[PDB]
RNA sequence: ACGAGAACAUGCGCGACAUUCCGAAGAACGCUGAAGCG
């Protein structure tokens, strides 16, 4: 049951990668699927459901005029704009596969994209003003939606888990996403429906299959899925996000999974991960696969 | 169990000091209290 999920972001979010001062515009799976644990943990909702029976797709732009799926790796017989194009719309994805997409065409279609401007808001602490120190300027980063355009991502689930995952993504709109949220940024509004167009691109058979969302498989899928892939192997590091976890802040176990975009002859089941260590509560990490069938 | 969690772009700071709306300039030029004589 492919269901699309439309964000709208109403204040600028930060959506951060390596640092607090470097903003993302959208943000991978394992994020939004860490956020609705949490989400479901605090609505006191069961986690097993949604960790077993929901695959997930990363979060990706889209205008009033069209929806933008990530570049496809595959092999290009110029090549800058290529590098710069990174998000197509779908339509125009398909005929990319089939490789009629030139260089100045690409370019157009990178420069079609209007998702919204990434800036930067310098805050300072004054905590230690109070007790006889200085206050200590920061930086935050922040990404601020053009009004028409918004974020989205495709998901696939049975239909108590589709209801779940409406509880969970309303309760979303006001816990928020990404960074230095409760602290004025990531607020959104989200609209569940199914869309008829991603159901007709999610069926499709192709010699190709291409990541829709960040994944690793396991050992034995490994063995049989890395060989003859074109991918991009993305590090997944943060700090553990929980009151529960230990009494001060820990790390997560570093992670490595293909990037969304990233194109398998054949296709591997995702995993959920567990990058804990020595803490109170596993810390789950999502990498399961949202396959796209295409033709080269 | 969102490169995350706290974290005020903030604190002290007068749009202020020096300035004459003055300088030059005749209310004066011409002008019979007079004409006819009933």
Redesign the pocket.
Known sequence: VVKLVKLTFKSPV???????S?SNHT??A??????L???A?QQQLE?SHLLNNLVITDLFPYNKTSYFLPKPLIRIEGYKAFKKLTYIPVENYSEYLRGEIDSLEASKIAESLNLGKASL???????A?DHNGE????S??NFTFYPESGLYFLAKGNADTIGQLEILMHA?QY??????????Y?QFRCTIEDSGKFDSLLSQTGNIAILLSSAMASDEELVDCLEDARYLLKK???????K??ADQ?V??KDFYAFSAGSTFYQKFNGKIFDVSDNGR?????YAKAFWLEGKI
């Open positions: 930060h959506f951060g990668m390596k640092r607090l470097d943000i991978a394992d994020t939004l699927f860490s956020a644990i949490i989400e943990l986690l808001s310098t805050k300072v602490s004054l905590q003003v206050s200590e300027p920061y935050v980063g979303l816990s928020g996403i990404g960074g230095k949220r409760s602290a004025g990531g997944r590091t943060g700090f553990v996000q929980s529960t976890y802040l790390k997560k509560h596993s810390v789950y990490r």
